[PDB]
Amino acid sequence: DIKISVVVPTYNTELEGLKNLMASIDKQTMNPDEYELVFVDDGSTTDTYERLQEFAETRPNMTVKQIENSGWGSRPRNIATKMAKGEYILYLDHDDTVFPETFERVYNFGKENNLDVVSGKEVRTNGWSWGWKQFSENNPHAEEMGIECLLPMTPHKFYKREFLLENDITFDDGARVLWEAVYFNSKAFIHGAKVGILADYPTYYWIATGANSFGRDPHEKWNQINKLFNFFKDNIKEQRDLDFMLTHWYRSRVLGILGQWLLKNNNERIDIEFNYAKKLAEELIPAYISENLDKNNQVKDYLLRQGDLDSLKKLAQIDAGITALSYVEDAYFKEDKLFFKTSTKMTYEDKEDFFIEKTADRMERILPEEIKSKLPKEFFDYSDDLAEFTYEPSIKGRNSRATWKIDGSTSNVEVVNKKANLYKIEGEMSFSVQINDYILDAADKKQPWDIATRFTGLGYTSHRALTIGKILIKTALINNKTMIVYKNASGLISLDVGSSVRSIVEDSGVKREQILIDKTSGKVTIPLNEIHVFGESLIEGNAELKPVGISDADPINVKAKLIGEANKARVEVLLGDEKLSGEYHLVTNIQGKKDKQQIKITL
Amino acid sequence: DIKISVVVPTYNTELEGLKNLMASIDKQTMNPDEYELVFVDDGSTTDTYERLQEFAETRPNMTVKQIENSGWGSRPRNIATKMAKGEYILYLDHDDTVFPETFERVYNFGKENNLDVVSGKEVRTNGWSWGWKQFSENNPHAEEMGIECLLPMTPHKFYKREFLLENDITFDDGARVLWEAVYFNSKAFIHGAKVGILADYPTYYWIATGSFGRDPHEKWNQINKLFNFFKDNIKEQRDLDFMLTHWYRSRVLGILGQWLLKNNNERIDIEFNYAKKLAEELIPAYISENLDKNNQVKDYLLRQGDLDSLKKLAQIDAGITALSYVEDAYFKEDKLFFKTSTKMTYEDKEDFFIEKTADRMERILPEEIKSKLPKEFFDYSDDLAEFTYEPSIKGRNSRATWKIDGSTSNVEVVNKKANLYKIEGEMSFSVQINDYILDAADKKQPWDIATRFTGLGYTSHRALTIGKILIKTALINNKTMIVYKNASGLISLDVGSSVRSIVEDSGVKREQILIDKTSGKVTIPLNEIHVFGESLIEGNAELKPVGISDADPINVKAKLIGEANKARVEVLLGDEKLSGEYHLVTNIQGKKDKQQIKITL
């Protein structure tokens, strides 16, 4: 009885990525006999099919099959879905990887809640967030929130196989189709799929490769956009779900070219896509959709229907550079957490303040008179929107690429009158980091982490790395965790845990005049200078001794321990049975990171 | 009568720089028969001496003589000085150039005021200022301010030849001596030299191109020799106190700040012990009274040998700066108006703070360091009104820098949170570009704007910046002016279409374009532009039919006219018969627009 079937369409697959893919599947905690691998090669010109057969020699649950070239992976996925015999289907691309506990966690969550679709937390290489809203916390009954529960609509979820067949849910293999997973996930919800969101564990890694061009030209792009919008209006029968998909895709893909997109494209490309977007808004988008959009997007929709492209270009110049960068006001360790105080304000490129202007009873967007004398009065009136600001912290593992919201933060955003009638938008936030909240695999215990802040307001979303101007290096030894918060070479805030990029002995310093040598016991005690120590810690390492002067001598390897107790830290070096006379260099090697403290001892 | 003798020592001279130097001399407005050239070759292992006398064939007043290699240009200058015969002497290095009106302006200034030394305004390739204090306005009685009037003490001044001989003032002829011109300029002042500061015109260009004093032991042997020279030869209390204070602060205390963070520990311990010994042996205690709080802290910890506290203080001070943002920029009448703001920060991020306790405004320091220092040295209370905030401008081609005058500024110490106080500044100023155009080349040049902020011992002179897009054009009295945010995000003023096309940035009204078949004049009005006064710029345009792929272009004549607060371009079709739609690009001052203009003829 097979629980999970892994559908993998392959075509000229990069071998190293294929080896990583096979590795991540082998590392699954689920028993290998409870799952199966269904590979379907899309007629690879290279030796991809021969390699897939070589992988299948040592794995009896892996089934390989080759088909004619089809151009995309929807047909290979369909053939593999019919060959598959597991309760749940995962559509894994040939250049992605799966986290080691995904199968057991996802199946248990779906089986216990009788889920037809398990939308598990997905990780991407770049960016500070992915599925920030949906991958917040677990939701066994996510379909009760509407079709939004399936966003982001990648095919990298788990689908109950019998549910797909009972409703004839396949991939669009009739022709080349952009966003084929939006059709797929939407069809699932249209047929009443019980959807659950598994957000407490990274299930899938969507890897960026650089080699990742159909639809790049403007005509096939808007041909697929018209095809996707028609599908929404024709297949989605629930009004709330239809209005959501219409609003979400009109805002992101149609109105999404009416802002900064206008400043990085030539005129003849703008005209083709502006006219395409104008006809689509008139023919397919009802007017009530824009009535529940934000002020700035209402302006874009209004001018689009007027054909006022020149005003949208001028607005794009006015809006260029708006952002919110957070500065570290304070950063320190207290007990077993790292504490932060951050501040931010809306600016143009971390420089002069962004302003809104107060006129009588309205807080208005600052616009030229030519543009204001064309828009409805309410479209640039931010008065009723000044209480929707959010200011939150996030974290990203530099190895796993997984991103998380940091819970428990305290933030506040004020609108402050700076000069005359101009108002700036200021934020203050304090939060703490408990690194155990984000360590889910064993590999997470040794990793550098990067801190970011997420600010939203007046339609703007700014998710940037946390930064600081002054030098910042602070260390901690907390319950067997070496921790270093520091300003990296880019001026951003990083947190090394487990000596993955820095040495805690180097960054803490050594009280070199306080080093103790016990000749009879052979112990050398090296107390650390500046470090926050909480709880008991013992990390085994080693040290190397070299005679001073004899620059070519073999290193004398010797046991060493990094100890944290009574709020103090030290490295104990054990000379053991080594007979030593003279002066020696001493270099500690804790967790693979050596120090540069120039330690010399005389024996 | 030879008015000026130009002394030039050469050794393995780069040929293209030697050509630029000679051309710099031939372009002088002074009669060539009133100056002479004295080139002394310090045993060049290249062929520059042969190429020197090549230049002496067509130039009669150029004397060229070779000596054995002395190692640096002290002996070649002394040999050229003796065999020279001019009234004033300029020491011109073989890789520098001199501005065209320098000889005339400097000599007239020295003759009219009987100056022994004319300290002309000097220009360097990099930086936002040079001689910011001394090169303000012209001063024919500069020696009345003290020895300070000769700073910066480069050898690139004009010295009366009679004065140097009547006092045996030469360069040190022995082994290499660092700051050879500080001895020279000091010895000139000690003998009561009539010093004049010519600041209204850039006279000398000290060029940065692609050494003794690199090892720490010889460095501090030279620093010791320099300080002993001041104490032994300077006889006026005010002059000695100045040179001691200035060089103790810049070269001795100057290694006790950020220098500690970009050097290895073994060199730090060498120079620190040298600096501590020199302060104890040569620097009286009262000199430190003339210093600011931060330098008084440095001096105190130096004399205590507390290098570790100095290292900690260096990390705390690392990154303190003041960047100015543009709050407003507009054209009014014949000038460009600016409004900027700044605050002291770390790397233009979080604020720099000072902390209030009782009635004291204190530098924020760790308790371990404050306990080691006298209370007054970290109390800023008496310094809270000593802030300067001024604008500056730099020609990108001439590399000349000027202070922009007429500015209004105001720096405030503001309570931000609890008892923390930040330092905020605001400034208004206008740019009259006529103030900085002195040579014909200065009319077509991009100008870079910067701001100068000082306070609490810190100096921050860096380019002005803006975040939002800024492009504003003006046509003011035959000057095309475009203030803009450059690719680096810094404020630049293009004058004369040196970088940007004014038509492309002004915008063209493609519906008000007129095509007059009677006279054959296509009028292309400009949209967003500022027009003051009357102006007319000659140019040309280019035609090409829309249909043909690579049709030969048809060139014409265009003109950029500014009148009645309006600017327009007039294209003259000439006598060519044309038919159909034609592309049309303009070319005013060598800049073609990208407006994609079509006319149906």
Ligand SMILES: Cc1cn([C@H]2C[C@H](O)[C@@H](COP(=O)(O)OP(=O)(O)O[C@H]3O[C@@H](C)[C@H](O)[C@@H](O)[C@H]3O)O2)c(=O)[nH]c1=O
């Ligand atoms: C090209 C192709 C792919 N496939 C399979 C290979 C994978 O299993 C699956 C998905 O392909 P991937 O390259 O992993 O998808 P991707 O989403 O990572 O790549 C995409 O990024 C866009 C930004 C670029 O325009 C394209 O490179 C596009 O393919 O499709 C076929 O089966 N047949 C084919 O002919």
Ligand SMILES: Cc1cn([C@H]2C[C@H](O)[C@@H](COP(=O)(O)OP(=O)(O)O[C@H]3O[C@@H](C)[C@H](O)[C@@H](O)[C@H]3O)O2)c(=O)[nH]c1=O
């Ligand atoms: C070496 C040498 C130079 N000279 C001349 C050449 C110049 O006219 C003058 C000074 O040399 P310049 O290269 O013009 O120096 P400079 O003052 O322009 O720049 C200096 O900057 C210092 C930071 C470097 O350590 C020096 O090596 C030098 O590059 O001395 C001699 O006459 N004889 C010599 O043997």
Ligand SMILES: [Cl-]
């Ligand atoms: Cl530029």
Ligand SMILES: [Mg+2]
């Ligand atoms: Mg992929």
Ligand SMILES: [Mg+2]
């Ligand atoms: Mg030189």
Ligand SMILES: [Mg+2]
């Ligand atoms: Mg900033």
